[PDB]
Symmetry: C3
Subunit: 271 residues, 3 copies
């Protein structure tokens, strides 16, 4: 399915099953397919599951402008409006944790039953004056330089630390092939602009606005989005949030810990 | 090109050339591109060729519902009506033999000049009480279990018995790459529901409804859809059907036996 | 974005940034993504960048008919008209040098500020009675035969001479994977007809119609489109054209010499 955002950007989404809705926001160089197993799992068990390709990614249009969290958050608002969703459980992975938090901050939580932040960049990923423990901006600047030289090889090399294959996690060649295939669908421009966005955007004000049940899940072996300065802090800053730590899990844990995640999502929805 | 099915599903198709129409229905985890050489061959020789991506596959939408042979047959009916096709020769490969057969069973043959069943699941693939020679259902249940764990690696491993590479057929790396790339476009949900559909659907009543010239072609090395219990029987059950057995040919014989298939299709059309 | 051509063919394009427009025409078995680094570079520096997927390629429709330079040129005209572009700099790579030249030839240069020809087939690629130095037609006949047997393996094998990898150019596996992925999106029919088109079409008359500033760039290690009989002659035949030769550069120099190309394009636009 598609809808057209305010600026004319066409956004691809899937809307499966019926019942209470669960809306998924994918990570960086991924698309809505990263959620296919969670969607099948929950839609076969009485839920409606919705997942979009972020602007610039997968099957969506690739606009030059609007590659920032405020626009990402408003794109989600438009999707929710378009389908007239109510009591939605928002689920964000990695950089996609930021647009679901920012949606709540910009639009409130009247339509929202709950929030799930999976290996998410919230509440803040990069360094700030009062957050020297964040990732230094020159680290991201280097990634951008590499992406602007050869993004295809960048993505290909990113598979190992993403899935923790370099630390003994086991992920098939098939999954690695699918990951690269999907990543190459994306815009070079959106790919690089998203680094800027997740490097620099501060979601600490957003955390104070989250007034729904919230589950934070993070792998403490995550090489991409460090657990200690992201998920651990998000769970403390969000009132009433629950935290689950998957021991030694990598960033790409929707793959390596698929069944555990499916069960945790179900348990949260049935709380 | 696209048409929209009754339930809102957008379906991609290609419609090439002019003349008497030949409408192709692809196999499992493939899409309309599996026919590109047959389409070029026949459309360069004065036929109109049409091939669609089944719902849930290729460039088509991925609906949660309607992944069953009655709906697939009705999709084909909608395409035929969409383009107002007459004297159409229907050509179905593998699981795609089922939806062309079920189209005739549900809609009759007023628009149909002839039927070709290529390595097809017809008349019945899975075991029934009166068909113990069919494939036991626990075989398909295991496939579903494996697809719900890692469909990307399932498809990758499937290449070998599909093309008979495991038994000495020679197929390029290029073709194996293209096969996996196209398979990964598909929905996880459609991929799994199709297994249920081809495992359990009985097309034996459909065979009695086929009242047009019919050619059945099957490889006798077919490791996926066994000739003895499918194409052999389909040819005996359809009145006036002709049977061609490709010696030592695998399931993926539109690739391994491309030229022979092209020439046999042309001869059938010219009969 | 998309527009619909005269014959109903839907063509995908990207339109990025603002400022003076630069319209890019890709090579054979590529798509608009081949320009992503040039588009990012120029659109980050005050230019509007536009690149389309040629009919039969990438994300565009795959028509049976119209796979010829006159139609290609008219598709470009229709895109220029669709966006009401003025003072456009046309940039064509490889076979795409032909449709920008033919667009000037058929429609004039009222809308055009400049022309850039990159490893282009202009002014004539294949042999003619007065051009025995051209590539013999049996060479292209053999490519077509191979493509009509196994286009996927043809493309895979083409990576090496395209990028000069067989002559010590260094190109990542990621770029080669991306090149194959994009090529496989294309129509078999379009892929084959384009060979006929660039083999046989004579752009020598077109050269005399080009009355705008023109930069010709070509690598003199080009194994696909020989510098001596194409770019070298195009630069001599177009009044006032500038020529730059990249020493030992291959056909796929937008990849191997990306930064040098970006800087040359920018220098040209600023002249
Ligand atoms: Cl269960
Ligand atoms: Cl608390
Ligand atoms: Cl009979
Ligand atoms: Cl010169
Ligand atoms: Cl040089």
């Amino acid at each position: 399915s598609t809808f057209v955002a305010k600026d004319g950007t066409q956004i691809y989404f899937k809307d499966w099953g019926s019942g209470k809705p669960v809306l998924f926001s994918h990570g960086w160089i991924l698309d809505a397919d990263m959620w296919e197993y969670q969607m099948e799992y929950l839609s076969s068990r009485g839920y409606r599951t919705i997942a979009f390709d972020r602007r610039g990614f997968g099957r969506s249009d690739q606009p030059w402008t609007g590659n920032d969290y405020d626009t990402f958050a408003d794109d989600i608002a438009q999707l929710i409006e378009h389908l007239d969703l109510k009591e939605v459980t928002l689920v964000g992975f990695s950089m996609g944790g930021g647009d679901v938090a920012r949606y709540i901050a910009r639009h409130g939580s009247a339509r929202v039953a709950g929030l799930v932040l999976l290996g998410a960049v919230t509440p803040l990923f990069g360094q700030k004056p009062d957050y020297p423990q964040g990732v230094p901006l020159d680290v991201f600047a280097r990634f951008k330089t590499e992406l602007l030289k050869d993004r295809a090889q960048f993505i290909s090399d990113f598979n190992a630390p993403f899935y923790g294959i370099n630390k003994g996690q086991v992920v098939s060649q098939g999954v690695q092939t699918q990951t690269l295939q999907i990543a190459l669908l994306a815009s070079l421009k959106a790919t690089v602009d998203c680094v800027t966005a997740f490097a620099e955007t501060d979601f600490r004000p957003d955390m104070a606005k989250i007034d729904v049940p919230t589950l934070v899940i993070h792998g403490d072996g995550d090489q991409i989005v460090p657990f200690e300065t992201t998920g651990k802090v998000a769970a403390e800053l969000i009132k009433g949030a629950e935290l689950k730590v998957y021991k030694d899990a990598p960033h790409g844990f929707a793959v390596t810990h698929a069944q555990q995640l499916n069960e945790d999502l179900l348990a949260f929805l049935k709380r």
